[PDB]
Amino acid sequence: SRANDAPIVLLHGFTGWGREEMFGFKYWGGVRGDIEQWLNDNGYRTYTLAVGPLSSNWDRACEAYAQLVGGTVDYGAAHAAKHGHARFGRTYPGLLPELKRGGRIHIIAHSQGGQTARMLVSLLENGSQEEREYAKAHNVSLSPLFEGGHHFVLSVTTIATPHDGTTLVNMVDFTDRFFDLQKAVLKAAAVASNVPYTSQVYDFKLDQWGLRRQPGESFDQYFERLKRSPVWTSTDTARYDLSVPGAEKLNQWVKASPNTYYLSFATERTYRGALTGNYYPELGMNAFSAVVCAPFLGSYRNATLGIDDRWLENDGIVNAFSMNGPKRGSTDRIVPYDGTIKKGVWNDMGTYNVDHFEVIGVDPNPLFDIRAFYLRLAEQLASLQPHHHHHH
Ligand SMILES: [Ca+2]
């Protein structure tokens, strides 16, 4: 039964856009519909975050905070100076001013969005010691996000998240395939990549870096410039955070709050080969992933980097082994779901036979009851108790 009234907030990964972008083709629902609308219609108040898809988890968290409470994005003086980007970004009206009033939220995140959510919670709770100290030594102002003490998040749900990174980033032609992936997503929403569209369409939100598609520039050309930009070349990027070392690093500081519930969902759309031990993509997997990404993910081994046979099963984009929760360089606890949702630990809700894009409806899958998946999820989050009790 309903035990809390917190609103649900949806969060995307290395790909994603606002509800008004892509001519309305939703990241959350894709060809299958509108996930946010489905939840709202069924009585679970739901909102959508849109943040920089290629940006670091840190930038994304700063953007999320501001998008939630309202205001101008504050990346932190120490952080901005450390990476040579702007300190202030876009201004948001704020989706949930109630947060400043004691309200809470459930975050449902997909792909890299899971890392962002974890980071958000950490910053909210603990702030940033480095930002606090930089503020004091330089006499610069400080965003509340870096103070700590905030309690807005009742839970975090991650779906197909690379908590321990994805081996996809080790592909020699990663840079080109990655951007071709973006092109495939554009293709899914019936948008061409060789057309200099005058409407926005897909805003990558690179205010901090001063980058944006110009008049007369198609996505193809825009991506060519991005590839040579700091959002692809720096350590303050999705590219880095998505990597096995980059993830481990993030895990070294981004910890599970003992005040928040965490749910994890894994995905797989592969089959094992008997003679090679490798994993192959199943019939139905989004075409781009099956041809370009899956073969690699299910065959790439690296002993020195710790990548072995447990890393081969994948969802076409991320290794399944990486989803149940942070493990590399982490102190977080992961617990297999036993009918009871524990606090401050990762509740491994299992593995689902869906690919990276089918799970959000971007790639069709008629055997996947997407509406029921999310409704079941919403009902489960709504049943979370704001404070459980110790019993026999
Ligand atoms: Ca499919």
Automatic annotation (TrEMBL):
The EC number(s) attached to this protein equal 3.1.1.3
| Binding annotation for Ca(2+) | 284, 358, 363-364
Which chemical reaction does it catalyze?
A: a triacylglycerol + H2O = a diacylglycerol + a fatty acid + H(+)
Keyword check for Metal-binding, yes or no.
Answer: yes
**Chain ranges of the Lipase-like C-terminal domain:** 4-366
Protein's UniProt name: triacylglycerol lipase
User: What Pfam families does the entry give?
Assistant: Lip_C
Please list the GO terms describing molecular function. Answer: metal ion binding; triacylglycerol lipase activity
What are the UniProt keywords, alphabetically?
A: Calcium, Hydrolase, Lipid degradation, Lipid metabolism, Metal-binding, Secreted, Signal, Zinc
Instruction: Give the top-level enzyme category.
Output: hydrolase
Q: Which InterPro entries match?
A: AB_hydrolase_fold, Lip-like_C
> One Gene Ontology cellular component annotation?
extracellular region
**Record GO biological process:** lipid catabolic process
In which residues is Zn(2+) bound? 59, 79, 85, 236
Where does the record place it? Answer: Secreted
Superkingdom, according to UniProt? Bacteria
